[PDB]
Coordinates of all heavy atoms in Angstrom, one line a residue:
Chain H
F128 N 99.6 48.9 72.3 CA 98.7 49.9 72.8 C 99.4 51.2 73.0 O 98.8 52.3 72.9 CB 98.2 49.4 74.2 CG 97.2 50.4 74.8 CD1 96.0 50.6 74.2 CD2 97.6 51.1 76.0 CE1 95.1 51.5 74.8 CE2 96.7 51.9 76.5 CZ 95.4 52.1 76.0
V129 N 100.7 51.3 73.2 CA 101.5 52.5 73.2 C 101.8 53.0 71.8 O 101.9 54.2 71.5 CB 102.8 52.4 74.0 CG1 103.4 53.7 74.4 CG2 102.5 51.6 75.3
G130 N 101.8 52.0 70.8 CA 101.9 52.4 69.4 C 100.6 52.8 68.8 O 100.6 53.6 67.8
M131 N 99.5 52.2 69.2 CA 98.2 52.7 68.7 C 97.9 54.1 69.2 O 97.3 54.8 68.4 CB 97.1 51.7 69.1 CG 95.8 52.0 68.6 SD 94.4 51.3 69.6 CE 94.5 52.3 71.1
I132 N 98.3 54.4 70.4 CA 97.9 55.7 70.9 C 98.8 56.8 70.3 O 98.5 58.0 70.5 CB 98.1 55.7 72.5 CG1 97.1 56.7 73.1 CG2 99.5 55.9 72.9 CD1 96.9 56.4 74.6
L133 N 99.9 56.4 69.6 CA 100.7 57.4 68.9 C 100.0 57.8 67.6 O 100.0 59.0 67.2 CB 102.1 56.9 68.7 CG 103.2 57.3 69.7 CD1 104.5 57.0 69.1 CD2 103.1 58.8 69.9
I134 N 99.5 56.8 66.9 CA 98.9 57.1 65.6 C 97.5 57.8 65.8 O 97.0 58.5 64.9 CB 98.8 55.8 64.7 CG1 100.0 55.0 64.9 CG2 98.6 56.2 63.3 CD1 100.0 53.7 64.2
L135 N 96.9 57.6 66.9 CA 95.6 58.3 67.2 C 95.9 59.8 67.4 O 94.9 60.6 67.3 CB 94.9 57.7 68.4 CG 94.2 56.3 68.2 CD1 93.9 55.7 69.5 CD2 93.0 56.4 67.3
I136 N 97.1 60.1 67.9 CA 97.4 61.5 68.0 C 97.6 62.2 66.7 O 97.1 63.3 66.5 CB 98.6 61.7 68.9 CG1 98.4 61.2 70.4 CG2 99.1 63.1 69.0 CD1 97.3 62.0 71.0
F137 N 98.3 61.6 65.8 CA 98.5 62.1 64.5 C 97.3 62.3 63.6 O 97.2 63.1 62.7 CB 99.6 61.3 63.7 CG 101.0 61.6 64.1 CD1 101.6 60.7 65.1 CD2 101.7 62.6 63.6 CE1 102.9 61.0 65.5 CE2 103.0 62.9 64.1 CZ 103.6 62.1 65.0
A138 N 96.3 61.4 63.9 CA 95.0 61.5 63.2 C 94.0 62.4 64.0 O 92.9 62.6 63.5 CB 94.4 60.1 63.0
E139 N 94.4 62.8 65.1 CA 93.6 63.8 65.9 C 93.8 65.2 65.5 O 92.9 66.0 65.3 CB 93.8 63.6 67.4 CG 93.1 64.6 68.3 CD 91.7 64.1 68.6 OE1 91.4 62.9 68.3 OE2 90.9 64.9 69.1
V140 N 95.1 65.6 65.2 CA 95.5 66.9 64.9 C 95.1 67.3 63.5 O 95.2 68.5 63.1 CB 97.0 67.1 65.0 CG1 97.5 66.6 66.4 CG2 97.7 66.4 63.9
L141 N 94.6 66.4 62.7 CA 93.9 66.8 61.4 C 92.6 67.5 61.7 O 92.2 68.4 60.9 CB 93.7 65.6 60.5 CG 94.9 64.6 60.4 CD1 94.4 63.5 59.4 CD2 96.1 65.3 59.9
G142 N 91.9 67.2 62.8 CA 90.8 68.0 63.2 C 91.2 69.2 64.0 O 90.4 70.2 64.0
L143 N 92.4 69.2 64.5 CA 92.9 70.4 65.2 C 93.5 71.4 64.2 O 93.5 72.6 64.5 CB 93.9 70.0 66.3 CG 94.3 71.1 67.3 CD1 93.1 71.7 67.9 CD2 95.2 70.4 68.3

Side-chain angles (χ1 to χ4, degrees):
Chain H
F128 183 68
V129 196
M131 182 203 70
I132 210 165
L133 262 192
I134 322 176
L135 286 169
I136 293 300
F137 281 97
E139 177 87 11
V140 308
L141 315 180
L143 195 51

